[PDB]
Each structure stands twice: as structure tokens, then as C-alpha cells.
Amino acid sequence: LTPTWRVYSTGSNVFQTRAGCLIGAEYVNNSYECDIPIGAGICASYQTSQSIIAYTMSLGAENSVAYSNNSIAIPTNFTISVTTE
Amino acid sequence: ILPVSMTKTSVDCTMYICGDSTECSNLLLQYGSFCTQLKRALTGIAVEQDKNTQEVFAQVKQIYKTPPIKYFGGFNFSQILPDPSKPSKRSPIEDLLFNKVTLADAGFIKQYGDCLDLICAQKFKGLTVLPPLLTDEMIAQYTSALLAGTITSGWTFGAGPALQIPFPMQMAYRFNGIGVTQNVLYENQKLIANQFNSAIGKIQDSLSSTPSALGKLQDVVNHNAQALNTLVKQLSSKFGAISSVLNDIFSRLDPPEAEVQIDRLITGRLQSLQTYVTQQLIRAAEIRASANLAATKMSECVLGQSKRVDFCGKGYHLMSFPQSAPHGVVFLH
Amino acid sequence: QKLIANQFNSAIGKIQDSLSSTPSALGKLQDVVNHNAQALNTLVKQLSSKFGAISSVLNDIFSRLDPPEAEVQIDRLITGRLQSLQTYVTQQLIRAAEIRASANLAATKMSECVLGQSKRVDFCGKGYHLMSFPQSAPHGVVFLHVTYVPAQEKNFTTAPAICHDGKAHFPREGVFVSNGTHWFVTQRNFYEPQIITTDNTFVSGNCDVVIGIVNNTVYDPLQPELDS
Ligand SMILES: *[C@@H]1O[C@H](CO)[C@@H](O[C@@H]2O[C@H](CO)[C@@H](O)[C@H](O)[C@H]2NC(C)=O)[C@H](O)[C@H]1NC(C)=O
Ligand SMILES: *[C@@H]1O[C@H](CO)[C@@H](O[C@@H]2O[C@H](CO)[C@@H](O)[C@H](O)[C@H]2NC(C)=O)[C@H](O)[C@H]1NC(C)=O
Ligand SMILES: *[C@@H]1O[C@H](CO)[C@@H](O[C@@H]2O[C@H](CO)[C@@H](O)[C@H](O)[C@H]2NC(C)=O)[C@H](O)[C@H]1NC(C)=O
Ligand SMILES: *[C@@H]1O[C@H](CO)[C@@H](O[C@@H]2O[C@H](CO)[C@@H](O)[C@H](O)[C@H]2NC(C)=O)[C@H](O)[C@H]1NC(C)=O
Ligand SMILES: *[C@@H]1O[C@H](CO)[C@@H](O)[C@H](O)[C@H]1NC(C)=O
Ligand SMILES: *[C@@H]1O[C@H](CO)[C@@H](O)[C@H](O)[C@H]1NC(C)=O
């Protein structure tokens, strides 16, 4: 169906996902912030020359609390924040 | 137990109503755009489900980790923290809940290659399922990060930077927050730890037992399945026509009245689709309201200590623990 | 006071820059208007549908058809358009329901953040709520939440209790911290060390039931100087 939709050739590798088959985007192992949500944790964005790339979403920045059996952290400063809603 | 999201579905009117019939496509074209509203509504519903999941679960900007040593003032959280000895980094209680909920799900299958039989056979009838944006191992990672933050930092990580604190010290200050002096904990720590361990084990026994209390999550799945089954069975309705098959109508009838015969069939099936869409939107609204309540409960019981009566459990609230469930969430108060 | 006023002024100016910026975050108010306009437009456009009839014009269908079948042709068009109106009304009610829910939430938030101070976490802004300000918007309302966010933390040494004379001492409304050699008492939300005296602690029990007690001294502010 839609015979005109040849979608050129396999210039960009076809990436197979659980949602389906995506043609026209190149998979990368780098994790970036989501731009266009494809689904199942995969998002696509326009970046660097310039092309459309597909990747795996990152939950957030890693952290590790320095826990100890005698230790506490107390602030020495404060910040006043104004937010909209 | 609180529902969070539901299944994302898409329906193709042209193929569902008139499967492989060009004459039907030309005749449906005279009705204008009778399918954009349904497609737009379904896309909005799917986006709403994804947004609901993101608001409920994505509340921390950092992925905290627990120290390798699992000694917290004598308390044992080994039955709720994930273990790396499984492909799914899930707690034993999480595994029990998923095993209990999995009698029916969407199938887990979305490649469509292995379909040679309820979903993919309905796939030939324009009922597909879109995958959730967050997989269960990312929802699990979110829950594990939230649990780690709560055990280590307490309520400090929910309003800025995570601040470390000994676990007995956080319990003593939390007790002081409800009108009980901290010497009570410092003198009955062993008894309190024993009671907590026994209570957790009884939680495991309660869930592992037969009287499944997870009816709220099962009701949504059952309703969706039954609605889809009714819609697919509705294709057999005659709607006043001599027959329910378009090919048969074209072969056995001349155009002059075949036009109205199919117009009647189109009207009946379009009415069925609009009714189904209305039912889906109403259920989407109730599920979204439930999601909003769940979000309020997470933010007010998990991220802090609540003074509201009978809001986070029954009695005098101390803390709550989140666990992930299929299209839902489970709290331990 | 001066620093806090400067921070508040800077935060308000940044709020102006955020709103005046091109990436408008006011999509919630625009979504409702867009949805209503699109629904109304499709309702208007639905008039041109033939509904399977011979023609969509009443005058043409009346002049070019006999009454025996013109009646049912008009009845078909009437039924189709009535179905369209009932549908439109249904989505109008569902949207009104959602609007009412949002309005109820907004009213509760205004009454609980603007008219008072809220202890509910992540309800009136993000952080520790101080006050909120309402602003009027077309078919909506905008809140400006002022919160308190700690910063510049420092590590210390801490104890649950301090043993002085075979007695356990506990803080009144503070924590026990130590910069090393010495021990001080400070509030738990801001660093303000103080000497641990009998007016900063209360005595309960002995020095063999609390895990982690530390030997130290508690100063008596009455006997040494007012010994006359
Ligand atoms: C928090 O830290 C900031 C930056 O170190 C302090 O701001 C400085 O304050 C001093 C005196 O008030 C000024 O001379 C500097 O010009 C300020 N610099 C900046 C970058 O703001 C602030 O006073 C601290 N707040 C506390 C300790 O409560
Ligand atoms: C907390 O106490 C339990 C006692 O049952 C310790 O043993 C765990 O028991 C559960 C339930 O049978 C098992 O699923 C775990 O595998 C057991 N843990 C281990 C290490 O064998 C548990 O270890 C204790 N947790 C602590 C001390 O953190
Ligand atoms: C913690 O800070 C206090 C205050 O600076 C230190 O207490 C001593 O206080 C006397 C009284 O003025 C000073 O003459 C000493 O110089 C202070 N000691 C030091 C090392 O500065 C206390 O010693 C500090 N504790 C540490 C650094 O472990
Ligand atoms: C505070 O001083 C007492 C002084 O007795 C310490 O008590 C220890 O234990 C018994 C007495 O209960 C005796 O052996 C000694 O008097 C002490 N030393 C040892 C090695 O036992 C007590 O341990 C001190 N507290 C802290 C936190 O050091
Ligand atoms: C606290 O002390 C206990 C005592 O053995 C130890 O098991 C645990 O690892 C310690 N926790 C720390 C140092 O964070
Ligand atoms: C305490 O030291 C640890 C060292 O890993 C650091 O991560 C933490 O930020 C420090 N907390 C302070 C300085 O309040």
C-alpha cells in the first residue's frame, strides 16, 4: 500500500523495536533527553552532519548518598525560589 | 492498591468496518471526516496515560543507590529492595505481584511475527496495543531509587539535596514528630525492629496467600477485554440489512438499493465506534482521577510524613513504601 | 533581610524573563481553547455530509424528489445531524467535568497556599512553602510560589545523646553536631552551633541504654559566676 513510499534505500539502518519497524533513523548508544517519544523507552531527536537519531532514554543523573553511622549534613545557606503554575 | 494507567489502543475505521472493499472506501468518503475525532481522542487518551505514568513515577531528578551493606539499625528491607540475581531487578514482593497479575496481560508480544490467539487475531480487526513509554524495568528503577532515597536521606531528598542520616536517628526524629519522645525508640529499638520484621513477613504471607486483594487492577483489564470483545462481536450485527457481508451484498444486490443497505450498515457500525470511544474516554477520566489521587498519596506519604488522619494507612502514620504493579502502584503503610 | 530581598527581586525578574520568553509554558490554557475550536469547527463542517442521501441541500432535495421518499431522505439527514449534536453534547459534558475538576483543584490550592502556609509536601510549589500569589489569566489562574531551598551543606560528627555525670542528655529541639575536637548544638535546618548547656538539653535516664552516647561536659550557667 502507498506504492510511492519506497523510502529510498537502506541508507539509514532499519532499527527494529518492540513497537514496530522504524525506517529513517540511526540508533545510538548514547542516552539523551527525550524529544519525540517513540515508545518503550526510545525517543528520537535531531542532532549532529545533522540527522535524525534514535536512542534509549535515561532515567536521570546517577547519585550515591555518603551514608555512615556517624555523619550528618546541615546546610549553611538557603535559596529563595519562585515557581509558576 | 491504586490504578495508574491503562492500555493504549488504536482502531482503523476503514479496515474495521469494510475490510478490503474499495467501493466501501469510496462510499465512506462521502461522509467527510468521521474518523479524525476518534483518532484524536484515542491519541489524547494515550498521551494522557503516558503523562499520568510520568507524573506518578518520575519525581526524582537523581538515581540514588543503596550501600552494599544492608544493615539499617537492625531493620531488614531485603524483601523490598531489588536484587541483581534476576534478569528483572525486582523485589520478592514485586515478583509475587507481577506473577499474580499476569493471568492476563496485553500479551507482552508486539513483534507480530510469532502470531502463527486473542490479541493478534483481533489485530486483523483493528485493535492494536501501543507499548508504554516506560518499561517495567525503568518503573522498577524509579521505585528502587525512591526507596533508597527514603531509607538513606529520609524526607530531605524530596525538597533539595539528599542529606544522609543514621536510620535510628531518622526514626527517632519521626517518632518525635508524632508526639513520642525519642528515648522510647532508643529503649525499644530491638522490639520495634522485631515487630517490623514480623509485619513484613506477614505482608509476604498475605500477598502469597490465595485471597487476592488486587481486584482493582484486574477490573480495568477485565473491562477493557470485555469492551473489545463486545466491539469485535458487534461486527456480526445485521443492522436491518439482509446480510452482514459487504462482498455478499455487492454480488447478490444491485447498486440502487445496495447503496442504502451499506449506508445503514455504516451508520450502525459508526454508532458502535462512537459508543466505544465514549466509554473509553469516560474510563480514561476515572482512571486519570485515580492517578491524581495516587500521585497525591505518593507525594504526601512517601516523600514525607503525613499528619492527616486515615490518609496514609490506618493509625498514626510513620512512612510509606511504593511498589510497582501492572498499570498501578502498591503502597506499604 | 537585604540578601533575602535581593534574592526575591531577582527571582521575580527571572519570572518575568521566563514568561516573556518565546517558549511559552502556558499550553494548558491554549489546549482547551484549541480543542473547543476544533470540536466546534468539525460540528459546523458536519452539515455538508450527505448521510447517504441523494443531496445535502434541502431546497434541491425538495424540488428534485417526490414526497414519498423525500420524507425518509430528510429523516435520514435529521437522524445523522441529531446523532452529531448528541455526540457534541457528550464531549461538552466530559470536558466540562474535567474543567470543574481542575477548577476545584485550583480553588483548593489558592485557599491553602495564598490564604495560609501549607505543610503538605509538593502541594504549594516545590520545597518548603512560604507563600503564594495568584494572577488572573484568560480562563485560568497563575500561581507564584515562594519556597525555601537549603544549600551549601557541611559534614559533621553527631551523637544521639551525651553523657556528662552518668546521665544521658537529649536535645530539646535540635541536633548534636561536632566540627571535630569540640561538640556543639544547632538547629536541624540551618547551621548555628551553640554550646551544649543544661538549657539546650534535657536529662532522662543513664548512660548505658542509648547506642552511640558520647562522653562530654554540660555547662551550668548559674553556679560559677552567681556564687554570691
Ligand atoms: C550564600 O552564599 C552566597 C555566595 O557565597 C552569599 O552571597 C554573598 O553574600 C555576601 C555578603 O552577604 C556578598 O558580599 C557577596 O557578594 C554575595 N555573593 C553572591 C554570589 O551572592 C550569601 O550571603 C550566602 N547566604 C548565607 C550564608 O546565608
Ligand atoms: C531480615 O530477616 C530475615 C529473616 O527471615 C533475613 O533472612 C531473609 O529471609 C527472607 C525470607 O525467608 C529471604 O527471602 C531472604 O533471602 C533472607 N535473607 C538472607 C540474607 O538470607 C534477612 O536477611 C534479614 N535482612 C537483613 C538483616 O537485612
Ligand atoms: C570547632 O570550632 C570551635 C570554634 O572555632 C573551636 O573551639 C575553640 O574555641 C576557642 C575559644 O575561642 C578558640 O580559641 C580555639 O581556637 C577554638 N579551636 C580551634 C581549633 O579553632 C573548636 O576547637 C573547633 N573544633 C574542631 C576544629 O575540631
Ligand atoms: C564514658 O566514661 C565511662 C567511664 O567509666 C566509660 O565506661 C567504660 O566502661 C567501664 C565502665 O562502665 C569501664 O571499663 C571504664 O570506666 C570505661 N572504659 C572501658 C574501656 O570500658 C564509657 O565507655 C565512656 N563513654 C564513651 C562513649 O567513651
Ligand atoms: C553501622 O554499624 C554496623 C555494626 O556492625 C555495621 O554493620 C554497618 O555497616 C554500619 N553502617 C555504616 C557504617 O554505614
Ligand atoms: C560529606 O562527604 C561526602 C563524601 O563523599 C560528600 O559526598 C557529601 O556531599 C558531604 N556532605 C556535606 C559536605 O555536607
Residue numbers in the entry:
A (entry chain C): 626 to 673, 686 to 722
B (entry chain A): 723 to 838, 845 to 1061
C (entry chain C): 917 to 1144
Give the article text.
Here, we report the isolation of nanobodies that bind to the Omicron BA.1 spike protein by screening nanobody phage display libraries previously generated from llamas immunized with either the Wuhan or Beta spike proteins. The structure and binding properties of three of these nanobodies (A8, H6 and B5-5) have been characterized in detail providing insight into their binding epitopes on the Omicron spike protein. Binding of the SARS-CoV-2 spike protein to the human ACE-2 receptor at the cell surface is the first step in viral entry and blocking this interaction correlates with neutralization of infection. Structural analyses have mapped out the epitopes of these nanobodies on the RBD and have shown that the majority cluster in two regions: one on the side of the RBD, distal from the human angiotensin converting enzyme-2 (ACE-2) receptor binding interface (cluster 1), while the second are close to or at the ACE-2 binding region (cluster 2).
The monomeric nanobodies were each mixed with a hexaPro stabilized version of the BA.1 spike protein trimer in a 3.6:1 molar ratio and then vitrified on cryo-EM grids. The incorporation of six prolines in the S2 domain has been shown to considerably increase the stability of this version of the prefusion trimer. By contrast, H6 formed a complex with the BA.1 spike trimer and an approximately equal mixture of the two forms was observed on the grids. In one, an H6 nanobody was bound to each RBD of the spike trimer in the so-called ‘all up’ conformation, and in the second the RBDs were in a ‘2 up 1 down’ state with two nanobodies bound to the ‘up’ conformation but missing from the ‘down’ conformation. H6 is only able to bind the spike trimer in the ‘up’ conformation, with the epitope partly inaccessible when the RBD is ‘down’. In previous reports, and in contrast to other SARS-CoV-2 variants, the stabilized Omicron spike trimer has only been observed in a ‘1 up 2 down’ conformation in cryo-EM structures. H6 binds directly at the ACE-2 receptor–RBD interface and completely occludes the site of ACE-2 binding and corresponds to Cluster 2(21) nanobodies. The H6 trimer inhibited ACE-2 binding to the spike protein across all the strains tested, including eight variants of the Omicron SARS-CoV-2 virus.
